[PDB]
Symmetry: D2
């Protein structure tokens, strides 16, 4: 059959593997959301329109670069591209906007004739790392300047300094009033303003800088839906982000980025107070050995799956597509395996920010994700999500597991749920139904935010409330169905599970019913 | 409480190791009890005791007694049952089942006579021989016996305690050596294992008895000696179109019935493992194999299965059962039987209410000891994909009930079918079935864990109100009967429009 | 098709049940041991020979009844029946003898009398009942129940409790002479042992009994007291603790740790706790003994009706089969062999039910869970054992042949519940008899003096295991066999597993 | 803790994931074999010694390029580096040599010149042999004449490993008129793919036959057969290998749609499988390759046969010293899939970091092997494997079971052909399988089996066979202690047979290392 149904029926996992078929075609409804980083290559309204058509669900604003007005315009261009489809409300796709904070970054300085200048740090060389503003524009083959004054106090003799995504390596030999004398361990070529990593050194930069508070308040005052909080090391780092957003930003989802050894080891306490997680493999693969990142990835996704909270896998997923129109075999493998790992979202960075094929990269992620979602061994995944989820007396969670068990029984095409904040939809999403979870909401922000929950397809209902409440409920269900037929999710003859509550307002989801599509 | 550390276990072995004798069963008893009506259990006042003890189905054994006798049984059972209708929140429906005589073979005619082991014995069918059988001649009321048991075959008399080996097909009978001597009363039952009996699948007496059951409104027929699908059709023909609502439980009693089981189960409403006859027809050490096989396949099919015969046999004379009898009851419940049965323990024994009480107490403990983990998983994985909204709602409701350890699943049903579809996934939570059909209320006693409630008030002017007062009726009866407490969660299962077949809704509610 | 192999290969338990087949014939070798009680019905040498051929493996001497010389005559008759087959070394079946201790038994005195319900009776005739437990007047408070005769008789103590307990018959019935008395729910004082039990135990040591069924064991101390009273020559005698009351069940783990094995004594246990809960105690105890690798015995009223009837009831056949399915190593006949009219028939019945039931075990899941639950081990005997059972399941080997001195090699194979018969070849006469407690072990007593070179003495015992197996119908010319041996003489060094074709 | 055994013991797969720990070091030796492709960057003896030291187990000779004498030179340098470590018998690491055939390839023509094909320019594909040397920005020549009649209008023609694409505008007399879809710099003699086309090229060309006979006479251990479509193709390779090539292992490369759908019949007649992801990702949608990889690894694991994952595992390390996140993740996930081997192509044939690429695969494989959920894997392999009466497989599964029970460090097995080692490896023990053999070829070939560590025994036989048996066991122990697989106080399982010669394995022992 299609959607790898024979591999879904399998006795065992081994026999499930043996029955996967390249000829079996998947469902149109791709359920892992795609996050695209906005930059020069993806900033135009018309480019953004093609990225929404290819499947982008979350636009990422990287506040490591750009002014407040630069980002204000990209927010504007995105909202303009998005609302361009609002005329046909049965196809309208909400697109969320995420603010990715700069955080405690450390960067080198501008070199000799700044523009495009290159300097090769020869292996075996002596190089000085300086924090004197005189040497800030002074970069050469024996001098590097950094924007971290206290670097001279936290990197001991014998400590290793990484430059340019870890391809350059220095080892401190002496400390002096002129800075730190280092012997180059791993040479290479050095541009301007490259990131620096000090794994193991006790960096004293605050988790939330003075500009970060400014950036967060910007996002509140421009209406961002999601904050990606960089270099989160502890539960108190999430609290600072929460305070910074203040009462006006209480509705904003905080995804903590796990980027170093501390964040991995303090993982459980970070997840407890976050809304979700980003496995930030770039920084992570410099901070810990590269052959261990996948362990960190598979652990955090497992624990996020268990807890029911969104997990994002990020960085170098389709790296070569910066330059080439087709990805490497390792790159398609990587996207597929993050979907099979259980990730809710996958990310593109340079591939959409500055490469020559941003729309093709999104297309590629969409096509790989549809095949991989079909190849999940739902039989063991659902059974294990059931056993690991504790007993509950909340009617929303009880209705939710009932509806997912019901959806597997009839191979339902979808589970239509009414939700004010998204919570009813997220509780469905955490049992990983194969049926699409079609969330009908009046909340524009909730429509956007549910893109973090795998398998939730948001629909923004906008018609005004009807006189009788039960008629308003029925109308939104009918909106779910006809949006779903128009988008290819549903066909006449399908069964659908419909989830609703007994009274208006959030928190009262308690009804599940089985409907045939006529 | 309720052996849930054992229900929590990751493996069956760990599950056994964690069973606790000091864990009391909170749940109500879910396996129905059938009691056979006889001289020990016919007075209105005795029946009342037996109802309170827990009897859910009364079995009329049509192997004995005149039609007027069984009409008296029916009238007495109904009087004792309606004795409680004045309090509708606690009224227990009780089904009435008619057990057919069948293709019985008996010997000829307090009085006794011994047949010596190794004796030479004659079997003949001659009509004047019928009157005086001696220690060397046995007469049977089956003429074709002389054609059906060839040389070397065995003839069993009196519950298989006496056997005979045929040596030659004589001219005026069958010359047999006694293999197992014993002392033989008058007109006792004969079994012919490994014999092709041409006796009709439904005799003319059975047809009169099934018409009687229709006229008197029995809910259930236990059809004796069912060998093939066509035997069920003869029963369904004798019941006629007027008896279409009566459930047919086929009694598997011999080797053929075991071999043709799949074809029998498919045309029946359910099965009775009749271990008495079956343990004569096949070696006694094989009955448990047949019992577990048949309970298994009925479980897979979602059809009722009854375990019957000698479960508490010693309680005919003694006030306490043996250790083998208590484990037999428990193990039939563990196997997955929907019903367990008493025959002589209630028909003629000295302790009929005690035996009912013993089964009820054993059923409660054993139902708690079921390894629900592996069972619900295997049942949902074995059950095929369904597009029927009633079945889809059922499994969703059962999964929801396990998630919040709901005390009850309250369902509205007209034919019982929605209750039965919940029953087949074996919820731990009670299935409380609210129906206006008095007959359906009696018949769903066949399904394990269904507790019927007969709603008596006329339909409210607004249907949605009629549904809600039925649901509240389920809640109020539950609280009175100890199934529900204030603050519990219940799952409520209904349909989107009146009439049967439209169940499709599942809600979670908190009591009060 | 045979041995219920379709049901054994099913992927789920439910499918396993659905595939069970009344027409699938089982293997000749029954693996659950049969324990028969000796009594008037089972005491003649001729009869005992017939019971051995019907499959008795352990003969139980009930020291609750009879005198010391009575029991020594039983032992002599047992051994004369057993040793009548000793001219046949390849078919010789060891038969163990087990001493079931009297223990803290309370019995009435000395014909028959009826006790009407509501009557006033005194515990010191129809109104008087004598008891052989002096401290009963001190441990039964007022309102406390006294059960007599398998718990059929109920009594409740009146507020008078001085020179004899004045009582009220709570459940009337008929009372014989010297019938048991049970005092549940009231905390008792009677010693763990007695002078009779000590001397009974010592008599057991003098006459070479192999096993002790220790009555009414509620603590580790009881088992130590039993092993103490058995004396320095009493080592080597296996001690089965009989769990008989509420205290012994809930302190089970500390008892099993100290004991060689367990007997679920449902007779008394069904009086001491509600009868509805015995099956819980039975399944809990068999599971825990299975998890521990220690033999468990299921006992009492298994074929009760066969005391007077040639054919069991449907519940009795069911109960035997379900004890075997639960995992019991042994099953017992008490009155059915000791005093009834059909002692050989009752042994034949248990033998026939057990063979059917053993094939109907869902081995696939049983083996998996026994593996997962058994801990890691650096003992080469334990490592070789689970290797060999796993190898046995892959080739459907007819048997695992094992050389053992103490039986411990055989017991460690047996704890993984292999389907293949474990054929244990030993020189220790007593060990050959004691391994009947372990399901699946078929002991062979090797009688030859040792060969010069130890490696030829090993091959010879291995072939002795083959030839015996072929003669008895365990093995045949196409069967594959696993041979488990050791790298040096003396017990404790098992470490080799070989796969061989039985020529 | 170590070896991820908290995650190994978890009762569910989800819980096993949750317990994976980056601080848990792998102590088991590396079990997935590393195959390195020889080329300019890896043909010096000096670099080959560093690659053997970093982890290389098999050297791949790519017969798509280079003359026979070129390949004889590679073989000779490989052997010189490998025998540079003989003379220390307890640490000598065998290295197998594998011959990767050319197969039915399709190449463009001769143009060191380069031509740019620009996006949306119109290009002609011609077979006309006059144009064999006249290629430019709008005409391409291909060595496959029937390409005119098998590519319909609108079909696709891929050049340059799928980089450049051509949609057929029109078909005419001069050839196929096409337009660039994606342009790129087109070199001479580049590879061409025809997805969804009928290519009737023979499985075995004459030069392939010539190449196979070259490998027999130079004693290669393995043949990687390109573009296997059917069982018939494997028989042709075995036939061309001749009577002297009896003992050569044939790994079938699955490269296109047909080999995937005829996989079972190909698997039954092959010694093993390579997922050839480069060609395969051009012939089928790139989004479907992971499916075929996982299907094929599963079936080979089920069948107990070696499976190789290949192509672009560490591709960025051709020019960069450190791989990308996707690349490390890819290697880890191939080991977790169950691959017996992982492969390097341009990373070691031509890139600038050949030794480091090997090192990186070794370090990733070690972390991944410990992250295998052994509990479910061994259980499923047990019940999935059929009942057997061969005593070598009965012993193997008994020995693998015993090994898990005592957490043995090693299973020492004596083997002549390698078969008894392979029958242990198919049950995926965590304990290393230390295989002692006198057969130097078998020593090289069992690198195909995950978790097998070959030791080449060189002493002459002893007069009494029992003594010869046991000093071979002792050779494995001492080799194991020297290498770190084994330590005083460990338990090992020893697998041996009852009679000399192959096929008679049937004994398993548990012994303490002293
Ligand atoms: K950032």
């Amino acid at each position: 059959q299609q959607q790898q149904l024979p591999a879904a029926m399998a006795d065992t996992f081994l026999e499930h593997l043996c029955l996967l078929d390249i000829d079996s075609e998947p469902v149109a409804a791709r359920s892992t959301s795609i996050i695209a980083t906005i930059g020069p290559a993806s900033r135009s309204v018309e480019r953004l329109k093609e990225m929404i058509k290819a499947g982008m669900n979350i636009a990422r604003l990287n506040f490591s670069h750009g002014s407040h007005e630069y980002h204000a315009e990209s927010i504007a261009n995105v909202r303009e591209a998005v609302e361009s489809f609002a005329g046909s409300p049965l196809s309208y796709r909400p697109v969320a906007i995420a603010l990715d904070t700069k955080g405690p970054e450390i960067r080198t300085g501008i070199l000799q004739g700044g523009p495009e200048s290159e300097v090769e740090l020869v292996k075996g060389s002596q190089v000085l790392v300086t924090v004197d503003p005189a040497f800030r524009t002074r970069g050469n083959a024996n001098t590097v300047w950094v924007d971290y004054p206290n670097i001279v106090r936290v990197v001991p003799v014998g400590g290793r300094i990484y430059i340019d995504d870890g391809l350059i390596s220095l080892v401190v030999q002496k400390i002096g009033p002129e800075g730190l004398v280092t012997q180059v361990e791993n040479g290479g070529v050095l541009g301007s303003r490259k990131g620096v990593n000090l794994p193991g050194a006790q960096v004293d930069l605050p988790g939330l800088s003075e500009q970060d508070v400014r950036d967060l308040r910007f996002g509140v005052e421009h209406g961002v839906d999601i904050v990606f909080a960089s270099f989160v090391r502890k539960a108190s780092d999430v609290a600072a982000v929460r305070a910074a957003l203040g009462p006006e930003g209480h509705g904003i989802k905080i995804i903590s980025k796990i980027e170093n050894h501390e964040g991995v080891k303090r993982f459980d306490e970070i997840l407890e107070v976050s809304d979700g997680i980003m496995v930030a493999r770039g920084d992570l693969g410099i901070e810990i050995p590269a052959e261990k990142v996948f362990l960190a990835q598979k652990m955090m996704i497992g624990r996020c799956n268990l807890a029911g909270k969104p997990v994002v896998c990020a960085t170098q997923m389709l790296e070569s597509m910066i330059t080439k129109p087709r990805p490497t075999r390792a790159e398609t493998s990587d996207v597929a395996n993050a979907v099979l790992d259980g990730a809710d979202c996958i990310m593109l960075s340079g591939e959409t920010a500055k490469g020559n094929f941003p729309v093709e990269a999104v297309k590629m992620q969409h096509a790989i994700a549809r095949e991989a979602e079909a190849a999940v061994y739902h039989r063991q995944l659902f059974e294990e999500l059931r056993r690991a989820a504790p007993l509950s007396r909340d009617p929303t969670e009880v209705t939710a597991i009932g509806a997912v068990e019901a959806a597997f029984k009839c191979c339902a095409a979808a589970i239509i749920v009414l939700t004010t904040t998204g919570r009813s939809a997220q509780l469905l999403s955490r049992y990983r139904p194969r049926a699409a979870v079609i969330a009908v909401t009046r909340s524009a922000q909730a429509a956007r935010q549910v893109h973090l929950c795998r398998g939730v397809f948001p629909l923004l209902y906008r018609e005004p409330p009807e006189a009788i409440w039960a008629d308003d409920v029925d109308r939104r269900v009918q909106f779910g169905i006809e949006s779903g037929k128009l988008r290819g999710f549903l066909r006449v003859g399908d069964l659908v599970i419909v989830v609703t509550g007994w009274r208006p307002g959030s928190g009262y989801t308690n009804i599940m019913r089985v409907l045939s599509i006529s």
